[PDB]
Amino acid sequence: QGSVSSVPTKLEVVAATPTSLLISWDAPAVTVYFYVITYGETGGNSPVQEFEVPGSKSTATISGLKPGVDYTITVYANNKYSRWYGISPISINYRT
Amino acid sequence: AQTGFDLSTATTLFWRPVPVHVKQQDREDVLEELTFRILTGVAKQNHNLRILRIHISSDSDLFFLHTLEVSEEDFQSLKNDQGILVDFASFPGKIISLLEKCILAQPGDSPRFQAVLTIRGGESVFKIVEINDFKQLPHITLAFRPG
């Protein structure tokens, strides 16, 4: 039943600047209402930033990073399973 | 206008394109993907008045915008005009699942769900209909406003 997946897949960095990243991912099987993208420094205990991207989009640009620090980038989809099932995220770590 | 949407503590529910059959007065009919942004929030003078807001825009025309706001008070009148049987707490999920049906719709579907927007200057009527072997059947009808 690959039909019912709600988690995005193969989230990856396609382009980068010292302080800028272009990420992309593949949509899940379910219709995505909108995406929530989260990012913060991989070192613990300082806050994750968040913003929203439309459900039809498959990329997003992120600004204002520190050069040479790694960030944990997380994408999840709001969808029909969002009412009663947990957030189902995909995550990567990326440097510079 | 009436409502008073806070907008600074709004919760986003839905933000994506939906195929809509647009019918305009002096233009040919168009099938285009319109962006729907669905938020809920509260009034700016009264945090206990819940409000549903729907904005329709396109990616191709930035100044194209049609809006709808339904307070929980407004919903009682609207619930009896259309024979709606859910409460206000569940109403946004029914709208979203109908929009989802029109995203998933295929030309050969029967029943086929279809979204329609008709425009008279300063007023527009949005409906999601189900086309079956016998009739076009409206599941919801909503009055929108420019801007």
Residue numbers in the entry:
A (entry chain D): -2 to 93
B (entry chain A): 11 to 157
Question: What do the paper's sentences say?
Answer:
Centriole biogenesis begins with self-assembly of SAS-6 proteins into 9-fold symmetrical ring polymers, which then stack into a cartwheel that scaffolds organelle formation. SAS-6 proteins contain an N-terminal globular head domain followed by a long coiled-coil, and a C-terminal region predicted to be unstructured. Moreover, SAS-6 homodimers can form higher order oligomers through a weaker interaction between two head domains from neighboring homodimers, with a ~40° angle between the two coiled-coil pairs. Here, we developed monobodies against Chlamydomonas reinhardtii SAS-6, characterizing three in detail with X-ray crystallography, atomic force microscopy and cryo-electron microscopy.
In order to identify the binding epitope of the three monobodies to their respective target, we determined their X-ray co-crystal structure. Overall, we characterized structurally three monobodies that interact with distinct regions and have different structural consequences on their CrSAS-6 targets.
